[PDB]
Amino acid sequence: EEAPWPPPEGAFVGFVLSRKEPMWADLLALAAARGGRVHRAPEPYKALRDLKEARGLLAKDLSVLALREGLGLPPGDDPMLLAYLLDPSNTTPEGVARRYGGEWTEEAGERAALSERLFANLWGRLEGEERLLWLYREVERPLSAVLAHMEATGVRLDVAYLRALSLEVAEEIARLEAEVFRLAGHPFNLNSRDQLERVLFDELGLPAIGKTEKTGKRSTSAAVLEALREAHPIVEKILQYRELTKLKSTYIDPLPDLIHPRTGRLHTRFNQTATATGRLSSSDPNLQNIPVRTPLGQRIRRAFIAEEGWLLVALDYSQKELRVLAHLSGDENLIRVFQEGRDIHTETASWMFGVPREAVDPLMRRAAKTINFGVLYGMSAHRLSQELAIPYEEAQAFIERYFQSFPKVRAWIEKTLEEGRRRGYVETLFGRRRYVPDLEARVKSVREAAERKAFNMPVQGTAADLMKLAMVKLFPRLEEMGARMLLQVHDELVLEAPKERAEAVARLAKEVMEGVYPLAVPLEVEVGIGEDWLSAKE
DNA sequence: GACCACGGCGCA
DNA sequence: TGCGCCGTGGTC
Numbered sequence A: 001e002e003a004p005w006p007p008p009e010g011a012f013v014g015f016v017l018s019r020k021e022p023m024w025a026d027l028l029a030l031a032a033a034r035g036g037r038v039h040r041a042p043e044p045y046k047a048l049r050d051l052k053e054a055r056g057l058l059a060k061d062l063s064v065l066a067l068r069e070g071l072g073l074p075p076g077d078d079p080m081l082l083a084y085l086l087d088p089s090n091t092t093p094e095g096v097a098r099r100y101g102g103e104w105t106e107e108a109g110e111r112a113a114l115s116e117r118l119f120a121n122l123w124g125r126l127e128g129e130e131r132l133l134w135l136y137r138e139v140e141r142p143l144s145a146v147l148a149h150m151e152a153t154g155v156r157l158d159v160a161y162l163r164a165l166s167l168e169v170a171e172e173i174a175r176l177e178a179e180v181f182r183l184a185g186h187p188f189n190l191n192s193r194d195q196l197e198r199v200l201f202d203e204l205g206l207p208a209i210g211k212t213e214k215t216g217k218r219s220t221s222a223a224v225l226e227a228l229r230e231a232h233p234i235v236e237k238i239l240q241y242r243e244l245t246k247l248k249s250t251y252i253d254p255l256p257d258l259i260h261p262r263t264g265r266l267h268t269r270f271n272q273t274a275t276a277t278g279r280l281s282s283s284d285p286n287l288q289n290i291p292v293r294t295p296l297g298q299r300i301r302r303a304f305i306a307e308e309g310w311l312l313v314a315l316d317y318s319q320k321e322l323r324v325l326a327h328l329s330g331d332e333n334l335i336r337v338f339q340e341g342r343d344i345h346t347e348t349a350s351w352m353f354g355v356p357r358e359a360v361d362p363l364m365r366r367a368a369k370t371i372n373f374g375v376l377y378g379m380s381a382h383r384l385s386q387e388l389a390i391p392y393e394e395a396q397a398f399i400e401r402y403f404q405s406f407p408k409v410r411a412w413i414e415k416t417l418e419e420g421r422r423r424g425y426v427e428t429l430f431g432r433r434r435y436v437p438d439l440e441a442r443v444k445s446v447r448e449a450a451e452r453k454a455f456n457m458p459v460q461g462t463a464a465d466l467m468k469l470a471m472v473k474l475f476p477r478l479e480e481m482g483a484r485m486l487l488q489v490h491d492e493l494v495l496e497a498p499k500e501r502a503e504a505v506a507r508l509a510k511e512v513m514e515g516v517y518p519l520a521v522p523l524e525v526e527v528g529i530g531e532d533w534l535s536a537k538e
Numbered sequence B: 001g002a003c004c005a006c007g008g009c010g011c012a
Numbered sequence C: 001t002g003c004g005c006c007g008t009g010g011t012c
C-alpha cells in the first residue's frame, strides 16, 4: 500500500480540486499509485513539480492546472478516454467506476489507485479492438494535450465593449417590455413562460398550437409564436424581446465577470468525453454557442479579440457534414457537386425550385440549407413546414424530391439502419461506435426516434473525428510558428498568431485542415484574419 | 446558499 | 442530430 512521495516513473495520478474548473481550482490534494502502492503528497502544489506527466482519470484537468502554474505537465493515458471509446455513454469517472468496478471517491490516493485499476481493466477490454486503439493513440490521447493548452491559454475579451453593449440592449429591452405591457393592458413577468401563456391564450385568446412535452402546457416557443406573427402585434414584440434578453442574460452579462485574474483572459473547458457522437463540448462558459447568425447576435462576436500585437485566424470547413455524407453514402450527384467546386446549397435550391443555378436567390438558398440539414437530422415534414413556413404537403414534396436527386443517401440510411439493427451499434468512418438501443422497438415513435439518432451519428461523428485529427496535426506546426489554438466550434477553429506571422499561419492551417484525410470529395476551408472574431470571419 | 426539472434557445 | 446555460418555479 502506502509509500513515500515522490512516486516512481509511470505512476498514475489522483487529485482533488476545490471546484470542477481547473483554471479556477485550488489543488486540494495530489497522490500517485503504481503496483497498487499509493504515494500521497504532503503539499500538493510543490509535489506537482515532481511529476513528468499527468497519467490517470481526468488527466487533462490536472494538466490545465499545471500549465496555469507555469509547469509543463502533459496529459498522457486517461482511462476516461478508453471508456469513452468503448462506449460514448461512458462520460464521467463516477459512471465508469460504477460500470466497470470500483468507486469514485473524494480522496486523491483512492482516485490514483482507481485510475491505475481502471486503466488495466479498460486497456484489456480494448485488446484486439484495433480501430478503437488507433483512435485512442492517434486522436484522443494526443488531442488531450492540445485541449489542455487551449484551456490554459484562454481568449481575450473586450469587457468595456460588452459593458457598453449591455446598456444599449437594456434600453431596447425596456422599450419592448413597455410595448408588450401596453398591448396586454397590464404588467407581468415577460420572462415567465407560464405567465405569458395565460396572457396570450387566455386573456388575448390567440389560438394555442402545440403543447409542451413533459407537462402539456400550451407552448410559447419561437416556433409557435412565429406562426402567430400576424395574429397579433404583441407576438412580434415578444419575439424581439426574447432575442435581446437571450443575448443579455446568456452572453453580455455573464462573460465579463469570468475574466481570470492572472491571465486576464476567458477560459472555457473542452470536455472530451461528453457526447454520444464523438464531438467535443464546451462549458464554464460554453464558447461553442456564441451568437453569429443575426446582426444583433453577431455583435457579441466583436467582443472576442486578439492579444495586443496578435490577430485571430478563423478557419471553418465549408458544408462539412454534407461533404462527409457525400463520402459515406457515395451518392454520385452529391460527390459531383463538391468535385466540380459548386455550392451544394445553391445546386440543391436549383433542383428544389424552378432552377437554374443563376436564378437561385438568397431566400431559396436559405431554404435549401434547411432541407439539407433536415436530411442530416431526419427532421419531419411537419418541422420542415414550420421552418420554411410552407404548407405541410409542400415540405413533404421537398423531402421526396431530395431523395430523387440524391438516391444513394436513402440507400445509405437504410444500409446503416440495417447493420445497426444487427450489431446494436453504428460507427464513423474511423470506427468510433455509438450503441443505439430501440432500433427494433415495437412502438413506432420510439423506434423512429432511435433510427434518426443512429443514421445521424456516422455523419456527425466522422466530422468530429476529422476535426479532432486536424487539431492533433495542426498543433505542433502552430507551436513551431509561435501561434496558438484557442477555440474549436465543431466545424471551425480559432487561432491566435503574432501579426507578422498571421498570414503564414492562416495559409498553413488551411492546408493542414483541408488535407487532414482525403475523401471522395475535397474538404474546403474558408479562412479569415482579424483583430476580433467577427471581423476575422472573411 | 444550494439543488432540480422544465421550457426555451444559442451554436454546430 | 448533438450539446450547455438561461430564468422560473419549486424545494431543502
Ligand SMILES: Nc1ncnc2c1ncn2[C@H]1CC[C@@H](COP(=O)(O)OP(=O)(O)OP(=O)(O)O)O1
Pocket (backbone or CB within 6 Å): A317, A318, A319, A320, A321, A322, A345, A369, A373, A491, B012
Ligand atoms: N439553421 C440551422 N439548423 C440546423 N442546423 C444548422 C443550422 N445552421 C447551421 N447548422 C449546422 C449545420 C451546418 C453547421 C454549420 O452551419 P453553416 O451555416 O456553416 O452551414 P453550411 O453547410 O456550411 O452552409 P454555408 O455556411 O455555406 O451557408 O451547423
Ligand SMILES: [Mg+2]
Pocket (backbone or CB within 6 Å): A316, A317, A318, A319
Ligand atoms: Mg458554413
Ligand SMILES: [Mg+2]
Pocket (backbone or CB within 6 Å): A316, A492
Ligand atoms: Mg459557423
Ligand SMILES: [Mg+2]
Pocket (backbone or CB within 6 Å): none
Ligand atoms: Mg433540458
Ligand code: NA
Pocket (backbone or CB within 6 Å): A213
Ligand atoms: Na412525446
